[PDB]
Amino acid sequence: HITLDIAGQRSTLGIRRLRVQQLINEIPLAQLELHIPTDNHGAADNAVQHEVSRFTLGVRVGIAQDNKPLFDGYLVQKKMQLKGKEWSVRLEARHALQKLTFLPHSRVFRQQDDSTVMKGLLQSAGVKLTQ
Amino acid sequence: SLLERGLSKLTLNAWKDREGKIPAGSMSAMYNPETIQLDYQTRFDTEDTINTASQSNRYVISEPVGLNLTLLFDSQMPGNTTPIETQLAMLKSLCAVDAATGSPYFLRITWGKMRWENKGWFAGRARDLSVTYTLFDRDATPLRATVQLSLVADESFVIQQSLKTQSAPDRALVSVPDLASLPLLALSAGGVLASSVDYLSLAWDNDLDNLDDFQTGDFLRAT
Amino acid sequence: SLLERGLSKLTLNAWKDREGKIPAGSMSAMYNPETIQLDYQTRFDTEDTINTASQSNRYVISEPVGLNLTLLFDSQMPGNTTPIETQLAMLKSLCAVDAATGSPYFLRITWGKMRWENKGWFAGRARDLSVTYTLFDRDATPLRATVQLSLVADESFVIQQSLKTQSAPDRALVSVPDLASLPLLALSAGGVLASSVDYLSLAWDNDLDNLDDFQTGDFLRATK
Amino acid sequence: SKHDQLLQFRLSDWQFIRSRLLSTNCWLLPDAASDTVVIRPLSSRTLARDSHDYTLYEINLNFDNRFTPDSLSLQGWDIAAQRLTAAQKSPAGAFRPWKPAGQDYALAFSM
């Protein structure tokens, strides 16, 4: 089935929506959507509070579909709604190319190839170029 | 019974605010309704998941309890001297929009020995109403009414405050039975509070020494 | 029967949590319903595929089992002495939102030998309730009730996980018959697990030598 | 500190203000029902689920960390000294707008 790993633990919750997006020149992403149950009280009413509090911004998030790796990215932008008795939370997770996108750097790159500029430029996050 | 035999008509008491400080008029209905019904409705929705196969459903809202009752008025039989339009002057008035305030009149219905929703009274506002006059005379002063009231819950905000004070208070004060143990003392203390108190924090609150310092007859408090 | 002829009423037990840890009140109702009814329903949606090779319809969700049940209370016949408001002060309470937590009470209906959907009890919460008093007294103690309950399925998570491990608990332990073969032994192991256990993995997991190694009475272990 | 030389080069005159509030560590706080504005630098009521006084209906909160750095080490070219003035790094964790109950940005200007 579909198993959401966050920070190494398999994190038994209930996903109502999962959508993994992957394009041709863009950072691939993955939206989750969970439901935190409120109407079933007792021991599993605060034990589900412990499982959502582990969703800090920037954690290893892994999705596995039919015992194959689906997404494997870091977490950004945890939104929660809480309308009425509903209390949903929405996750997003971005690839390792998210470490490259909002910090203005400056280099020069004299006497280098087209590939040696760029494979040393993706290497700052741990992304391994294949070419 | 137990004192005397005489009819207790139902009374429609109306206020202007939720709490009942400002009183409107009141009327007692002749010809008791012969049937009342209180209808409940709690709305659920089936929760969905794509990981597991556990099947539960989500509590959405609780639609309030509605009271349906019908009344009949008559001013023809020789005991009935008062006209039915001065009696229907207040069912139409107290179950409509107030003149100065936009809200209705909060309509507290009561009967002599009948508990409605675990209380002696039934608060609420009239959702709808219908008078259908079926018999007239020569100038048509009306002679029959056939009223068809229907109400909602609308308890006061204070009454609703005290009822959740008698259920799950702030402090528990659970007892200690014979052959007791802290995993079971914190299991019955977590049933009064409905908040699952741990054995370890129940032990620190009472400052007991050895996790066995209860002596079958002393009281230890949970918070 | 088989011992004696006393009746067994139905009992409505209530809790507060999903499980049975925190008991609320619990009433038994006189004057049995005469008829129960539990309706199942499963929702399907038709595939409007453009390829037009096949007609089919997907499975979306199974609606929860709902139980309908109608009761009656009466206290003026001289065997009946408890006033019916004390018996309806529990149905009106247990089929409503609790003051402690702000939720329904997770009811559980039971009858002496009646077996509900596949268990000896019917868990769930109250969707609906309507009392309609028809007779009264001079001071109007009611003394006639006609209740019209309606519930949903909502079982606990420990019972639902236990029923899942009783069907395909990820090991098979398949016996071999006389005149057997591994494509047949994979179909008989792919029915215990419902996972298409792909016969080359059977001969690797059990250390077969030559794909015909089993001898008419030995077992083969199949995981996933 | 007094300015030596500002310049408003054909700005809207409101465009100039909130490009000058961004460089001064202040926000506007505009008030309706008046013409009074309290400009105050970037630096409780306790609405709770249990509390009777305020009724709640929806609480959306986004919790993003894309455009939130930790440093803002900004520096610029000193004309007199020509050292490209020492890097004034700002710590994250000062001015916390969200305080819970339970990457380094760096430019250098030629000016």
UniProtKB/TrEMBL annotation, chain B:
Organism: Serratia entomophila
Pfam families listed in its UniProt record: CIS_tube (PF19266)
Limits of the Contractile injection system tube protein N-terminal domain: 7-155
Keywords from the UniProt entry: Plasmid
UniProt name for this protein: Afp7
TrEMBL record, chain D:
Domain of life: Bacteria
Organism: Serratia entomophila
Annotated protein name in UniProt: Afp8
